[PDB]
A paper describes a structure:
Earlier measurements of the contributions of individual mutations to binding affinity (Dejnirattisai et al., 2022) show that G496S and the triple-mutation S371L, S373P, and S375F reduce binding by 2-fold and 2.2-fold, respectively, whereas BA.2 lacks G496S and has S371F. This may account for some of the difference, but more likely mutations on the edge of the ACE2 footprint (R408S and D405N only present in BA.2, G446S and G496S only present in BA.1) enhance binding of BA.2 to ACE2. Structural differences are observed at RBD residue G446 and at ACE2 H34 whose side chain has rotated ∼120° relative to the BA. RBD/ACE2 complex (Han et al., 2022; McCallum et al., 2022).
S is the major surface glycoprotein on the SARS-CoV-2 virion and is involved in viral attachment to target cells via the interaction of cell-surface-expressed angiotensin-converting enzyme 2 (ACE2) with the receptor binding site, at the tip of the receptor binding domain (RBD), in the S1 fragment of S (Lan et al., 2020). Following attachment, cleavage of S releases S1, allowing a major conformational change in S2, exposing a hydrophobic loop that executes fusion of viral and host cell membranes, releasing the viral genome to initiate viral replication (Walls et al., 2017). In-depth structure-and-function analyses of 27 potent RBD-binding mAbs isolated from vaccinated volunteers following breakthrough Omicron-BA.1 infection reveals that they are focused in two main clusters within the RBD, with potent right-shoulder antibodies showing increased prevalence. In summary, we have presented a structure-function analysis of potent human antibodies induced by Omicron BA.1 breakthrough infection in SARS-CoV-2 vaccinated individuals.
Residue numbers in the entry:
A (entry chain A): 19 to 615
B (entry chain B): 334 to 527
Write the structure that this text describes.
């Protein structure tokens, strides 16, 4: 038997053994997240440890088959993903040091508390304490206190840990024959051996920077409009030509500008579309919300939810004694078991989240026939993009009127269109420079282009230049403000939120064209279009079996990430922003700072 | 004499498909119509015979093969089928003359935490002949190095378990199958009756 034939038999044994052990771990994990007990924590750990030990053993056995002697690519993809060393390429001591560093940074982030001055007992955590301040407070000093105290008392603890974290992660990546840990993260987009669909790791940097140049004009006019509105609210705190102070952006970091809507709403006398009252008027419950979401996917040709979905999912808060983790999640336990965990309320937000989460389920059900190691999104940004486009169609007035939640007499004028697009841009467009700049800083740190004694100097030079955001207090190199965000201190790649954002509007534009939608893209509803559902399903069933460039081509006809659909979505707002900024300064100077005086 | 079909369909435990059980039925009256009008009924496909006009002709011997597989594998209990079950566990001939009966047994053969009583053969040197049974436990040699009787690199135990849990999808839930073979040799009729 050849080496490839032995690998096929090895993967055959792995699949049946992995599915069983993955199901037992997922089932134990489900029982804890729906029934937070002490016994369920141990059963979740016992089942989880057996699954992690199985993967570690199978990874070593997989490295006994040389990839070069395998020619069938679908076999090479499964072997490659299983042969991935990760932290197991380091010595046992250095991997133990790294895991201790990772746990300490995660513990500092989740337990980090800030105490109000003159009262060492009135202390606040990030969630919900500091997050509530950064999302609702209009007081300049209260927001400044929360922004600075979080970074000066929790961020400074993470600075020495993050320095050693970079050293060990780079040693791990370079031992896996990567340039550095950032190049290791960019491997998620790598494709080799498929003529016409290949993609290098360094190509991601060029494509992200190239598409971001086309985003700058829209962002600069969004930035200039927000600055002018905030300048009317804080006249003595904001310069007409300077960056936006970092603590006045809607959350702890300015990751999204969503909470700036109250102060920046273009037409503040026209109310939003909130069908929450109509859902309560019609006595809707959680099952009705997911039944309507099920009807949505059925209307485009996708299958209904399984019988086990309705029986095994937790669509309502268990209430009273039995506690649960109420964060909405879509579960793919394998072996035909699909569930959704969600403490659903009768609101419009949960109505849209249900369509978002059930989009993950439709994705999981579509590639369930793939081999175990290929059951995932085409890349890290595919799964979340599929979920986002479901809430896009479900939130439109055209869709809400077809299901009886929005009044037919309710008419939509261009002022409510601008209000909606501005609300969308604060979340979607506002996060793109944040995401790109944060990941570029980490890429350069891992690449060695930023010395340790200039980490925070370069972090805020890039905030001012790229993001147009200035720190309200000067920070020396004892700070580690990037680590004050969850994803940085918890070792998660961040560029996935940039690529996913561009993917979702490429998906939506393609599906709406298949649905023969006429008019602006943001008003599209793909409901009742089996042609759009068929075009989406051709990519969903692929899973990870094909290059993501080919999976993207099945939906949109293009092989690469493209920013034009994003700009098409926001064009009515872009033209309105350019007219609003005609007597305002567009762009920002980088030398002004709120503490310069 | 009524044919002992109750011992086959209503057995407490079914056999594993790799060690499928066969019960020879002889010298009795079989109301093939009284077995078709039951509650728990799902798959009932006959080949070469007619289920409407079942208990009308006579056979020399009737064989009842019973085992358990998952839902998505009931399709393999048919002539000219491929897959782990049809190739390595239970194979029907191309000219099969009989009926295949299957029903969902998730209430009996599943258990919270996993029921590992039922096994199936995952690897074998060659495919099975029709109505052949292989209960060997020889370590399958996938490579060239001998296995010495223990599992190791390129040396796998040939039998795999289902681990039936009641929360599986229908395609993974246990199904009890009964295969009725109808033989007609050069001997006077022994099994027929309305
Ligand atoms: C949750 O755990 C408690 C603690 O033993 C138990 O009494 C209860 O029956 C469990 N509920 C479910 C739905 O498993
Ligand atoms: C690759 O192997 C799989 C089985 O692992 C097989 O189904 C498929 O046809 C093979 N493809 C090629 C191109 O050989
Ligand atoms: C992973 O490390 C093992 C040794 O721990 C080695 O045998 C294998 O070749 C390595 N694989 C890669 C891709 O670095
Ligand atoms: C899905 O809908 C079909 C009818 O189109 C129905 O026969 C089937 O039972 C449904 N599936 C579930 C799990 O309810
Ligand atoms: C979709 O079709 C249903 C009937 O099948 C109809 O009630 C609904 O209004 C339609 N919605 C759209 C957006 O066409
Ligand atoms: C909305 O359209 C009307 C004409 O229908 C126009 O006069 C008005 O300026 C428009 N407003 C915006 C914000 O586009
Ligand atoms: Zn999601």
């Amino acid at each position: 038997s050849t080496i490839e034939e032995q690998a096929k038999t090895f993967l055959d044994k792995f699949n049946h053994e992995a599915e069983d052990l993955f199901y037992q771990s997922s089932l134990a994990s489900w029982n804890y997240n729906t029934n937070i007990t002490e016994e369920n924590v141990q059963n979740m750990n016992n089942a989880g440890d057996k699954w992690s030990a199985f993967l570690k053993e199978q990874s070593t056995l997989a490295q006994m088959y040389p990839l070069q002697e395998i020619q069938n690519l679908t076999v090479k993809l499964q072997l490659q993903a299983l042969q991935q060393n990760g932290s197991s390429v380091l010595s046992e001591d250095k991997s133990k040091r790294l895991n201790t560093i990772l746990n300490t940074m995660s513990t500092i982030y989740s337990t980090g508390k800030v105490c109000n001055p003159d009262n060492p007992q009135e202390c606040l955590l990030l969630e919900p304490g500091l997050n509530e301040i950064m999302a609702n407070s209009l007081d300049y000093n209260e927001r400044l206190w929360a922004w600075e105290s979080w970074r000066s008392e929790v961020g400074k603890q993470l600075r020495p840990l993050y320095e050693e974290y970079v050293v060990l992660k780079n040693e791990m990546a370079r031992a896996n024959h990567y340039e550095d840990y950032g190049d290791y993260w960019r491997g998620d987009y790598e494709v080799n051996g498929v003529d016409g669909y290949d993609y290098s790791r360094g190509q991601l940097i060029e494509d992200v920077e190239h598409t971001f140049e086309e985003i700058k004009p829209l962002y600069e006019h969004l930035h200039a409009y927000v600055r002018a509105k905030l300048m009317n609210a804080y006249p003595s705190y904001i310069s007409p030509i300077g960056c936006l102070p970092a603590h006045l952006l809607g959350d702890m970091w300015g990751r999204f500008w969503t909470n700036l809507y109250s102060l920046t709403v273009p037409f503040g006398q026209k109310p939003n579309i909130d069908v929450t009252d109509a859902m309560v008027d019609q006595a809707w419950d959680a099952q009705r919300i997911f039944k309507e979401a099920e009807k949505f996917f059925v209307s485009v040709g996708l299958p209904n939810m399984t019988q086990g979905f309705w029986e095994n999912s937790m669509l309502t808060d268990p209430g009273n004694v039995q506690k649960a983790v109420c964060h909405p999640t879509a579960w793919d336990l394998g072996k035909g078991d699909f569930r959704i965990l969600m403490c659903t309320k009768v609101t419009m937000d949960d109505f849209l989240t249900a369509h978002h989460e059930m989009g993950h389920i439709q994705y999981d059900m579509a590639y369930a026939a793939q081999p175990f190691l290929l059951r995932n999104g085409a890349n890290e940004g595919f799964h979340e993009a599929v979920g986002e486009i479901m809430s896009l169609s479900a939130a439109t007035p055209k869709h809400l009127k077809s299901i009886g939640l929005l009044s037919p007499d309710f008419q939509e004028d261009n002022e409510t269109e601008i209000n909606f697009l501005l609300k969308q841009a604060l979340t979607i467009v506002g996060t793109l420079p944040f995401t790109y700049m944060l990941e570029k800083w980490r890429w350069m740190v891992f690449k060695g282009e930023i010395p340790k004694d200039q980490w925070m100097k370069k972090w805020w030079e890039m905030k001012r230049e790229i993001v147009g955001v200035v720190e309200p207090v000067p920070h020396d190199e004892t700070y580690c403000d990037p680590a004050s965000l969850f994803h940085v201190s918890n070792d998660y790649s961040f560029i996935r939120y940039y690529t996913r954002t561009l993917y979702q509007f490429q998906f939506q534009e393609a599906l709406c064209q298949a649905a023969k939608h006429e008019g602006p893209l943001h008003k599209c509803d793909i409901s009742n279009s089996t042609e759009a559902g068929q075009k989406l399903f051709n990519m969903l069933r692929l899973g990870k079996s094909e290059p993501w460039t080919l999976a993207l081509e099945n939906v949109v006809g293009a092989k690469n990430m493209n920013v034009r659909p994003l700009l098409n979505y926001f064009e009515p707002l872009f033209t309105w922003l350019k007219d609003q900024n005609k007597n305002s300064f567009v762009g920002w100077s980088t030398d002004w700072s709120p503490y310069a005086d | 004499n009524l044919c002992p079909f109750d011992e086959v369909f209503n057995a407490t435990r079914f056999a594993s498909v790799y060690a499928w059980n066969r019960k020879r039925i002889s010298n009795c009256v079989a109301d093939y119509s009284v077995l078709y009008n039951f509650a728990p009924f799902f798959a009932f496909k006959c080949y070469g015979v007619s289920p409407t006009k079942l208990n009308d002709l006579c056979f020399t011997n009737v064989y009842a093969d019973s085992f358990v597989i998952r839902g998505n594998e009931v399709s393999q209990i048919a002539p000219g089928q491929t897959g782990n079950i049809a190739d390595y566990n239970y194979k029907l001939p191309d000219d099969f003359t009989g009926c295949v009966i299957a029903w969902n047994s998730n209430k009996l053969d599943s258990k919270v935490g996993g029921n590992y009583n039922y096994l199936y053969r995952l690897f074998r040197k060659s495919n099975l002949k029709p109505f052949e049974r292989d209960i060997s436990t020889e370590i399958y040699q996938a490579g060239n190095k001998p296995c010495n009787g223990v599992a190791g690199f390129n040396c796998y135990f040939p039998l795999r378990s289902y681990g039936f849990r009641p929360t599986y999808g229908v395609g993974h839930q246990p199904y009890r199958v009964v295969v009725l073979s109808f033989e007609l040799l050069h001997a006077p009729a022994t099994v027929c009756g309305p």
